[PDB]
Design an enzyme around this catalytic site. Sequence first.
Site, PDB file in Angstrom:
ATOM      1  CB  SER A  27       2.517   6.932 -10.313  1.00 17.83           C
ATOM      2  OG  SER A  27       2.305   6.414  -9.391  1.00 17.83           O
ATOM      3  CE  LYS A  58       0.021   6.803  -8.866  1.00 17.96           C
ATOM      4  NZ  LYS A  58      -0.159   6.485  -7.380  1.00 17.96           N
ATOM      5  CB  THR A  59       0.360  12.665  -4.302  1.00 19.72           C
ATOM      6  OG1 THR A  59      -1.028  12.457  -3.465  1.00 19.72           O
ATOM      7  CG2 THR A  59       0.707  14.019  -4.782  1.00 19.72           C
ATOM      8  CG  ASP A 105      -2.959   5.448  -5.307  1.00 22.02           C
ATOM      9  OD1 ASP A 105      -3.753   4.744  -5.013  1.00 22.02           O
ATOM     10  OD2 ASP A 105      -2.404   4.560  -6.013  1.00 22.02           O
ATOM     11  CE  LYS A 139      -4.109   0.977  -4.808  1.00 22.61           C
ATOM     12  NZ  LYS A 139      -2.819   2.728  -4.932  1.00 22.61           N
ATOM     13  CG  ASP A 143     -11.190   1.670   8.436  1.00 23.80           C
ATOM     14  OD1 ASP A 143     -12.227   1.244   8.838  1.00 23.80           O
ATOM     15  OD2 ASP A 143     -10.674   2.221   8.768  1.00 23.80           O
ATOM     16  CD  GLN A 182       0.240  -9.757 -12.966  1.00 21.14           C
ATOM     17  OE1 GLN A 182       0.884 -10.512 -13.808  1.00 21.14           O
ATOM     18  NE2 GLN A 182      -1.052  -9.291 -13.134  1.00 21.14           N
ATOM     19  CE1 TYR A 183       5.339  -1.382 -13.877  1.00 20.83           C
ATOM     20  CE2 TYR A 183       5.971  -3.136 -14.071  1.00 20.83           C
ATOM     21  CZ  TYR A 183       5.729  -1.963 -13.466  1.00 20.83           C
ATOM     22  OH  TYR A 183       6.652  -1.312 -12.440  1.00 20.83           O
ATOM     23  N   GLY A 240       4.561   5.767 -12.958  1.00 14.49           N
ATOM     24  CA  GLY A 240       5.463   5.796 -12.232  1.00 14.49           C
ATOM     25  C   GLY A 240       6.807   5.284 -12.145  1.00 14.49           C
ATOM     26  NE  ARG A 241       8.230   0.218  -9.890  1.00 15.77           N
ATOM     27  CZ  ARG A 241       7.568  -0.523  -9.186  1.00 15.77           C
ATOM     28  NH1 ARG A 241       8.200  -1.147  -7.941  1.00 15.77           N
ATOM     29  NH2 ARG A 241       6.123  -1.174  -9.189  1.00 15.77           N
TER      30      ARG A 241
HETATM   31  C1  6AU Z   1     -10.459  -2.783  12.836  1.00 15.36           C
HETATM   32  C2  6AU Z   1     -10.594  -3.575  11.567  1.00 15.36           C
HETATM   33  O1  6AU Z   1     -10.559  -3.612  10.717  1.00 15.36           O
HETATM   34  C3  6AU Z   1     -12.041  -2.581  11.090  1.00 15.36           C
HETATM   35  C4  6AU Z   1     -12.978  -3.626   9.935  1.00 15.36           C
HETATM   36  C5  6AU Z   1     -13.938  -4.093  10.334  1.00 15.36           C
HETATM   37  O2  6AU Z   1     -14.282  -4.359   9.076  1.00 15.36           O
HETATM   38  N1  6AU Z   1     -14.859  -3.304  10.747  1.00 15.36           N
HETATM   39  C6  6AU Z   1     -14.135  -2.054  12.074  1.00 15.36           C
HETATM   40  O3  6AU Z   1     -15.564  -1.758  12.630  1.00 15.36           O
HETATM   41  N2  6AU Z   1     -12.877  -1.737  11.336  1.00 15.36           N
HETATM   42  C7  6AU Z   1     -12.367  -0.627  12.814  1.00 15.36           C
HETATM   43  O4  6AU Z   1     -12.934  -0.914  14.346  1.00 15.36           O
HETATM   44  C8  6AU Z   1     -13.394   0.818  14.619  1.00 15.36           C
HETATM   45  C9  6AU Z   1     -14.439   0.328  14.994  1.00 15.36           C
HETATM   46  O5  6AU Z   1     -15.504   1.165  15.659  1.00 15.36           O
HETATM   47  P1  6AU Z   1     -16.633   1.086  16.502  1.00 15.36           P
HETATM   48  O6  6AU Z   1     -16.696   0.042  17.692  1.00 15.36           O
HETATM   49  O7  6AU Z   1     -17.644   0.487  15.230  1.00 15.36           O
HETATM   50  O8  6AU Z   1     -16.272   2.448  17.416  1.00 15.36           O
HETATM   51  C10 6AU Z   1     -13.361   1.640  13.393  1.00 15.36           C
HETATM   52  O9  6AU Z   1     -11.520   1.778  14.203  1.00 15.36           O
HETATM   53  C11 6AU Z   1     -12.772   0.926  12.468  1.00 15.36           C
HETATM   54  O10 6AU Z   1     -12.186   1.090  11.263  1.00 15.36           O
HETATM   55  C1  6AU Z   2      -3.358   3.950  -9.000  1.00 15.41           C
HETATM   56  C2  6AU Z   2      -3.566   3.106  -8.201  1.00 15.41           C
HETATM   57  O1  6AU Z   2      -4.653   3.063  -7.469  1.00 15.41           O
HETATM   58  C3  6AU Z   2      -2.679   1.547  -7.770  1.00 15.41           C
HETATM   59  C4  6AU Z   2      -3.712   0.657  -8.372  1.00 15.41           C
HETATM   60  C5  6AU Z   2      -2.955  -1.140  -8.628  1.00 15.41           C
HETATM   61  O2  6AU Z   2      -3.560  -1.794  -8.987  1.00 15.41           O
HETATM   62  N1  6AU Z   2      -2.246  -1.281  -9.087  1.00 15.41           N
HETATM   63  C6  6AU Z   2      -0.278   0.304  -9.411  1.00 15.41           C
HETATM   64  O3  6AU Z   2       0.206  -0.042  -9.335  1.00 15.41           O
HETATM   65  N2  6AU Z   2      -1.540   1.495  -8.228  1.00 15.41           N
HETATM   66  C7  6AU Z   2      -0.439   2.263  -8.393  1.00 15.41           C
HETATM   67  O4  6AU Z   2       0.177   2.682  -9.236  1.00 15.41           O
HETATM   68  C8  6AU Z   2       1.441   3.520  -9.067  1.00 15.41           C
HETATM   69  C9  6AU Z   2       2.369   2.343 -10.194  1.00 15.41           C
HETATM   70  O5  6AU Z   2       3.260   2.768 -10.003  1.00 15.41           O
HETATM   71  P1  6AU Z   2       4.792   1.867 -11.196  1.00 15.41           P
HETATM   72  O6  6AU Z   2       4.122   2.705 -12.344  1.00 15.41           O
HETATM   73  O7  6AU Z   2       4.631   0.419 -10.932  1.00 15.41           O
HETATM   74  O8  6AU Z   2       6.170   2.448 -10.565  1.00 15.41           O
HETATM   75  C10 6AU Z   2       1.899   2.404  -7.721  1.00 15.41           C
HETATM   76  O9  6AU Z   2       2.208   3.899  -7.018  1.00 15.41           O
HETATM   77  C11 6AU Z   2       0.716   2.042  -7.095  1.00 15.41           C
HETATM   78  O10 6AU Z   2       0.909   2.908  -6.104  1.00 15.41           O
END
Ligand code: 6AU
Ligand code: 6AU
EC number: 2.4.2.10
Lengths: 257, 256
Positions: A35, A59-60, A90, A92, A95, A209-210, A228-229
Amino acid sequence: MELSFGARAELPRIHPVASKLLRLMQKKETNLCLSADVSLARELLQLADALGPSICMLKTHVDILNDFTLDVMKELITLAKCHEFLIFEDRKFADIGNTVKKQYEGGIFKIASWADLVNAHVVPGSGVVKGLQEVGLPLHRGCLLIAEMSSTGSLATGDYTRAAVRMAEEHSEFVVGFISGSRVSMKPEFLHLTPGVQLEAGGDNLGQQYNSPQEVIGKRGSDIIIVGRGIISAADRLEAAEMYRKAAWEAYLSRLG
Amino acid sequence: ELSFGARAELPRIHPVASKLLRLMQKKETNLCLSADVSLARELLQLADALGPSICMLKTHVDILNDFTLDVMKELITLAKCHEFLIFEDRKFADIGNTVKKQYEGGIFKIASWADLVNAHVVPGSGVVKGLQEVGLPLHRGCLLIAEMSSTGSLATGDYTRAAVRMAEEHSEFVVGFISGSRVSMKPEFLHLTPGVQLEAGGDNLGQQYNSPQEVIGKRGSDIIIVGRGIISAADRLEAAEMYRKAAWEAYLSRLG
Ligand SMILES: CC(=O)c1cc(=O)[nH]c(=O)n1[C@@H]1O[C@H](COP(=O)(O)O)[C@@H](O)[C@H]1O
Ligand SMILES: CC(=O)c1cc(=O)[nH]c(=O)n1[C@@H]1O[C@H](COP(=O)(O)O)[C@@H](O)[C@H]1O
């Protein structure tokens, strides 16, 4: 019966990206994902070069790079090809489907152009995966679903985890595995990658948590450790990576018998 | 039921929430534009033309093909001129140590220009603690995603209840929710609802729409978030006005 990484790489329903990964894991004797949680492109690339031979994956978090450019990612790809590791952004994604497709393909980062793998939260429902697929499938990419998290108070438990597994298994043309704390799928075609890993007990001050490589790989049945760390904060990052690699690899072998 | 203007004065109100509520009352708008575009020039032209009609402009900075910090400076100028807040819909969703860097740093430097951001609660409360380390000193606010509009959403039941508890326990920084309905009974929290169009329907990737009257009037939310209902229209100003009038009258009706 439990299969080696090399045999898993040949499974009938294996995804090409997973197969590539599994083959290089076996070839290099590594199931370590670095990481690379740094803010400087030069440090990212120096780490990728020096640690490349020790890792199956880098992982970036591209959105923390102060001096991101697409040229940096080109240099990273060169290192990934030279040393044989996959690049995992990474991001995540989390939406609605229509939004994540643009976040994956477009913007300044153009993540799909350089990332072999991305990950997604399952909380929006399967539209998140369908949206990403529209970009990822033509670009020959793979995705990991976040089935469990390592942090204190995680809501990715119980029925939520089960939903992530079902979503993965129903989008197997794109989804190649999980971010999880343990084995969550019984299907060997899926990868399990586990963050929250250090050799020593502890955590951080913001809910991390590790657990050890032996615990995560050996006892909990995961495939890959994400560190990572434990590496990056060490004085000698190469030696640290080697310690993590040897730990994860031996735990894998021992579970394999 | 208190008006937006009275809610702006509540004892436990967050300053960002108060600013928003005051300009909603002043301008008679509870419409948030979801400016889901890829060109800076289109973003800015929408912000300028629609600014008088909106209380908030929501961005997805990571879809802007020509993002620069100077673009965001120009957006702030418009926000100050027309009086609306800027909400970056980043959906932070990582461990606390990671999100603090994603919020403050990188290319986007989101905390430097976004009045509001949002976060998923799935990582546990560390996601909020990480964000607040950056956001509190920068006098920012945050929205927690308690519900989602999309088909198959897992932000239901105990998950939603966990979002509400997390908000209520971080009230120095969390000012409200993304939700489909009122989820907290505390009037100091804002409810912002996406998945809004005048006509029934959805999209081909799981989005589901409900009307402003349904969301504000029946479901008790405060603000509608509207993207394609406005952005895909020929005349985006008239479209925004239609949504503004719908949402505002639904609010008035509920207020009695
Ligand atoms: C605002 C938000 O957090 C989000 C969460 C969600 O549950 N539904 C959703 O549409 N959105 C966002 O709202 C906008 C809806 O756009 P729309 O009216 O469907 O063209 C998009 O930019 C989504 O990324
Ligand atoms: C990989 C991933 O999807 C994610 C999910 C999660 O539940 N826990 C977590 O630490 N991560 C990521 O892994 C890395 C953990 O780094 P660390 O070893 O704690 O320095 C970080 O870059 C987090 O953003």
